[PDB]
Amino acid sequence: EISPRAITMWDFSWLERRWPGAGYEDWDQVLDELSERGYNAIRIDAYPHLIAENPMKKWLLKEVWNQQDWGSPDMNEVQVQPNLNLFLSKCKERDIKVGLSSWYRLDVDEVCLKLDTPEKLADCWLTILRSIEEDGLLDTILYVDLCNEWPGDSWAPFFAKTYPNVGWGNWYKEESLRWMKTSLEKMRQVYPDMPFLYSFDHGDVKKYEEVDCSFLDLYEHHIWMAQQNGGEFYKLVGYGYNRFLPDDYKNVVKNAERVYRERPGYWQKLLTDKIELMASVARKNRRPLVTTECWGLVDYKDWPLLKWDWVKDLCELGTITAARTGMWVGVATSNFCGPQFAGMWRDVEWHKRLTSIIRSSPLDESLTKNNEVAAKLLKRL
């Protein structure tokens, strides 16, 4: 039978967080730790825009934030190739499959802004895929996502500049659908059997049913308890995703746990209701699901007075709920599943119990029988 993969998002941290103690200095050690925990897939940023401009250039990147522990809290320098192929080879050696995505990290020359048409964006990914195929590593790639949380302007400013009227998260608007469709057609002229998609965080999962998005081979949907019911949890806590100031986190310290423990069942029901709803939509549309950003709080970190226990509780619930539906082919336990989140990474048995459940969950027959689109991803698991 085909087994789902237990996946973790290593985003742009795999390449960037390699200063002393940053977490990803020794890829063999962290990939051994990852396998020991039972994960067998990773979602990473491929930096296609940088590879397509100059693959061996040492690029100076501007930070996205200084309040979070993903990637760099200040300026940093990266060289994408051969580092990507090196990293992919270490994955292959350990039978870890890799999903590619991008957050289109801003270098000082902001090269991603040039990708202002779906054809340009596709040409850029066609280049990165050929760089991977040069070292015979394409079979290690599980899927290709053209943009994290499409079409948010933080990640896709090259799109948001041209179509300011679509707005954050509205992937289902006509301009977005058209762009996505044209880009994926260009991809399939070269890689017809590779699963392609764009990943979304928009909370109204019923849009998958209301619009023609059949051109997506899978759905990678980000789901957090904290964002449910119009972001009720965070409105209560006082968290606004501030990227450079500490005040939002101070509210997380003061209120997050309190707000949750006041009525854990209520929060848990918001989470599981969304997960079940997503599975329903996926089953109707006959598409496999992957979730790499989940399941409790969106932002968290090792910090004084931040406890991980209640967050792990929500992650465990999310994981087990998703896995049981049969619609997920790739399931993450959380978006803190890496060596820089000591509080999340450390309890090896907690991971092993969940990855065991994920990897032994049977898939729905809507995916395994008479489904050529789904078979593109299933054959790679």
CA distances from 80 to 53, 61, 109, 305 (A): 11, 12, 16, 36
Give the integer Cα–Cα distance in Å for 21 and 30.
Answer: 12
Q: What is the DSSP letter of 227?
A: G
Give the integer Cα–Cα distance in Å for 268 and 274.
Answer: 10
Residue 201 backbone dihedrals phi, psi, to 5 degrees: -120, 0
| Contacts of 160-167 spanning 24+ positions with Cβ under 8 A | 161/113, 161/116, 162/116
Task: Name the token pair of 329.
Answer: 């082919």
Q: Which CATH number covers residue 340?
A: 3.20.20.80
CA distances from 322 to 110, 269, 304, 331, 368 (A): 38, 13, 31, 8, 17
Range of the domain at 32: 1-381
Residue 256 backbone dihedrals phi, psi, to 5 degrees: -55, -55
The label of the residue with tokens 């948001």 reads 160
The answer to whether the Cα torsion of 215, 157, 191, 367 is positive or negative is negative
Which residues, at least 6 apart from 98, have a Cβ–Cβ distance to it below 8 Å?
41, 42, 43, 44, 88, 91, 140, 141, 142
What percent of the chain is helix, strand and coil (3-state, nearest 5)?
Answer: 45, 10, 45
Give the residue among 117, 110, 99 at the shortest CA–CA distance from 10. 99
Go through 32-67 and write b for each residue having 16 or more CB atoms within 10 A of its CB, e for each that does not.
ebbeebbbbbbbbbbbbbbbbbebebebebebbbeb
Give the integer Cα–Cα distance in Å for 275 and 68.
Answer: 26
Number of domains in the chain: 1
The DSSP annotation for 303-332 comes to -TT--SHHHHHHHHHHHHHHHHHS-EEEE-
CA distances from 122 to 117, 223, 325, 335, 377 (A): 9, 27, 33, 27, 20
N-terminal to C-terminal alpha carbon distance within the chain:
11
CA distances from 142 to 95, 139, 278, 293, 297 (A): 11, 7, 21, 17, 26
